[PDB]
Ligand binder design. Structure first.
Ligand SMILES: CC(C)(COP(=O)(O)OP(=O)(O)OC[C@H]1O[C@@H](n2cnc3c(N)ncnc32)[C@H](O)[C@@H]1OP(=O)(O)O)[C@@H](O)C(=O)NCCC(=O)NCCS
Lengths: 39, 313, 12, 361
């Protein structure tokens, strides 16, 4: 974690989605960075 | 009442800064120390004192309880706590030995002649000075190891930073008269690649500077220090020709508003409020030039411009 | 520091 | 996840992430992959054609071949594979590269360090024998026709001249003193016709000058050894190197004391590195973690939301997770931006292009 002061874990894991949606441009961008292999 | 043997760690952990008066307060977070539930089981009437000298921040620890379950698998609260404080720099249980130790330390204690001064300001008739240091220095390391637990107790997801990384730079806020530490800010710098032309022209290396952990100790909050400290740093970065942008790691809503306030009035003071809310007909290269001149992060920049466009439409 | 592999043919 | 569980997961998201993906099983695994600079030409049937050089590795069971492959891509990339030429080769092909100034000529190197000159039209032309053991390093100057640089596991580096007359089977110059262990890679600089770089198992990275008696201008100690290095095609000062510790490092040639930055993402050693010729600041890496990763140097240190920081550092554009084994080699197509050819150990060559929806494209 190069130069990270807040890279620890959060208190809790959020259950609500700040964006439920099908696919959009930043959804594709996030998908690619995940390599399309997250859950 | 056997449930009195389960405590909220946020309540049990009593944090004190002792200057003239011992000022006591609670942590916001304890989970990275005592687990996600922030509960401690097995101790009755549990108290955990974590105290610091208001100047040298010599840490003291003392754990109290009326009873403790004998069986193992219950947490050694003191051991856990000490594992997050500097090794062999914490006085355990003996208040008077602790007072002795920091009374002797205040004699030789002077950041004002080991650190580079940054700026100086005035709040409520008191004079404050801002200092800067690396984290490879032995004395900066002594102080930082002492205060970094405050990052964990008060900033969510905070982690301890790598003191061997030379790109760490800490800013220190002292009360000029009393020599007391009001806050500290951990900052970092990343190479900024501006494309082949620029890179090949300036042999002088360019960086995005970053505010990472920004802490004003609870006793000194809500008095205008954060704004003055945020303002001092940004200003010295505006004067640093190696810095291209100012960035912030994971800010909370409080810092969101602090950043927005101070950035907003810098733009007003430079007249960009009037430039943007009265002149739609601007080249895109004026917008870039403005941003670069201001050293603002791109998305923050857009927010402020839109915020100005609408505020005086 | 690459580790040259052992080769295999096609299962059809 | 299992690698097969993960592969089906990747495959279910292919239509969203890629404009194009094709997968091909090879009788034998290739250790090398390069696109030819054959110009885009549309064929009858609405396809455009590209060409690819690949090789074989049989571990001695069959004979080896230098292969030339025709790739027929969808017209909208601005669809099978076909081997149009097949030349026999002495031992496995560890690296094969075409001469920039004359694409009829392909240089190869094998597992005994022998270097070959093949013609597309006539086949094996010359044998260049000097290195005495396997070599992964092979590089043509883009700036001086025929200038060839080879490197071996036997710590040696050779310079040849093959873009003229005379006999090319004898090296113009050799070095036994550059490194004290395996030569992992060597590359010509892209602006300075005399510069080249070496990275070795001796944890050194060296910048060298062919004109000079004392060859080396700069020596750099590497955290663990680097397996590869690449020079920018846009900046004459910028280079990148990576290896056993998984990080991709950037260096400024004007000051090699410390790296500029290192990029984190790979979970194992990095084996290949490349700068985009199309977009200044784009670096693509691959290695033992079975992955290809595309990077954008202009986002190094950019501000992220905490939710984005969770998917990786801001400079990471994309991860290619289509392979099910370590990546042997990949190449960026010089005619069609973002088109990639990559080849894994388990006899698979994929050809792919990221989604146009990616901000970077
Ligand atoms: C920065 C910090 C010290 C606050 O600094 P600040 O500049 O005073 O912040 P604020 O602007 O929100 O608060 C000042 C307000 O209190 C008021 N105030 C000033 N002096 C006061 C006093 N003596 N009595 C009561 N109120 C007072 C002011 O009027 C001002 O309000 P205004 O804008 O209407 O004029 C603190 O709140 C903080 O952020 N600490 C860091 C802890 C943390 O979690 N950091 C994570 C960041 S990584």
């Amino acid at each position: 974690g190069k130069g990270l002061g807040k890279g620890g874990a959060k208190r809790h894991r959020k259950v609500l989605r700040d964006n439920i949606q099908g696919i959009t441009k930043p959804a594709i961008r996030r998908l690619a960075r995940r390599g399309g292999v997250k859950r | 009442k056997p449930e009195t043997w389960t405590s909220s760690a946020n309540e049990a952990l009593r944090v004190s800064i002792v200057g003239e008066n011992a000022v006591q307060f609670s942590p916001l977070f304890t989970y990275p120390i005592y687990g996600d539930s922030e509960k401690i089981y097995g101790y009755k009437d549990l108290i955990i004192h974590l105290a610091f000298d208001s100047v040298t921040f010599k840490p003291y620890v003392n754990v109290k309880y009326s009873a403790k379950l004998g069986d193992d698998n219950i947490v050694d609260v003191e051991k856990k706590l000490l594992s997050f404080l500097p090794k062999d720099d914490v006085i355990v249980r003996d208040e008077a030995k602790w007072v002795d130790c920091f009374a002797e330390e205040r004699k030789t204690h002077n950041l004002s002649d080991v650190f580079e001064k940054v700026s100086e300001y005035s709040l409520n008739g008191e004079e404050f000075v801002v200092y800067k240091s690396s984290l490879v220095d032995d004395f900066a390391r002594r102080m930082h190891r002492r205060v970094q637990i405050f990052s964990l107790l008060f900033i969510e997801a905070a982690n301890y930073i790598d003191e061997t990384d030379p790109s760490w730079q800490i800013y220190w806020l002292l009360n000029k008269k009393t020599k007391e530490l009001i806050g500290f800010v951990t900052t970092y710098k990343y190479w900024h690649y501006l494309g082949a032309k620029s890179f090949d022209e300036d042999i002088d290396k360019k960086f995005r500077a970053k505010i990472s952990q920004f802490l004003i100790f609870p006793p000194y909050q809500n008095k205008g220090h954060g704004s003055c400290l945020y303002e001092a740093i940004i200003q010295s970065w505006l004067e640093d020709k190696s810095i291209t942008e100012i960035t912030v790691e994971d800010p909370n809503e409080a810092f969101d508003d602090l950043r927005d306030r101070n950035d907003i009035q810098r733009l007003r003071k430079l007249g960009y409020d009037a430039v943007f809310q009265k002149h739609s007909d601007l080249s895109d290269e004026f917008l870039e030039s403005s941003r670069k001149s201001l050293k603002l992060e791109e998305r923050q920049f857009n927010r402020l411009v839109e915020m100005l466009l609408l505020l005086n439409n | 520091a690459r580790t040259k592999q052992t080769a295999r043919k096609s299962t059809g | 996840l299992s690698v097969d569980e993960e592969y089906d997961l990747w495959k279910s998201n292919v239509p969203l992430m890629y404009d194009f993906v094709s997968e091909t099983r090879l009788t034998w695994p290739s250790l090398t992959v390069q696109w030819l600079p054959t110009p885009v030409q549309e064929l009858d049937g609405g396809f455009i054609k590209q060409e690819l050089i690949i090789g074989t590795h049989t571990s001695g069971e069959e004979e080896n071949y230098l292969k030339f492959a025709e790739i027929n891509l969808p017209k909208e990339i601005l669809s099978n594979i076909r081997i149009t030429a097949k030349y026999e080769h002495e031992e496995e092909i560890t690296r094969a590269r075409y001469m920039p100034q004359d694409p009829n000529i392909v240089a190869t190197i094998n597992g005994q360090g022998t270097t070959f000159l093949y013609s597309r039209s006539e086949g094996l032309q010359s044998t260049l024998k000097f290195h005495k053991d396997n070599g992964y390093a092979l590089s043509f100057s883009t700036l001086v026709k025929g200038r060839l640089l080879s490197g071996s596991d036997d710590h040696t580096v050779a310079l040849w001249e093959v873009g003229s007359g005379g006999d090319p089977t004898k090296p113009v110059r050799t070095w036994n003193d550059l490194h004290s262990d395996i030569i992992n890679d060597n590359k010509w600089h892209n602006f300075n016709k005399d510069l080249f770089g070496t990275v070795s198992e001796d944890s050194l990275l060296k910048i060298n000058d062919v004109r000079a008696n004392n060859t080396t201008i700069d020596t750099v100690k590497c955290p663990q050894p680097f397996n590869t290095l690449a020079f920018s095609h846009h900046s004459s000062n910028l280079l990148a190197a990576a290896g056993m510790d998984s990080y991709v490092y950037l260096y400024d040639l004007r000051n090699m004391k410390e790296p500029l930055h290192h990029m984190s993402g790979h979970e194992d050693a990095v084996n290949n590195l490349e700068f985009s010729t199309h977009v200044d600041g784009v670096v693509v890496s691959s290695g033992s973690d079975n992955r290809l990763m595309m990077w954008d140097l202009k986002q190094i240190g950019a501000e992220q939301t905490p939710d984005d920081a969770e998917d990786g550092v801001p400079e990471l554009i994309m991860v290619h997770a289509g392979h099910r084994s370590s990546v042997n080699d990949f190449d960026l197509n010089p005619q069609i931006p973002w088109l990639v050819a990559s080849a894994e150990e388990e006899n698979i060559l994929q050809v792919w292009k990221c989604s146009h929806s990616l901000p970077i494209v």
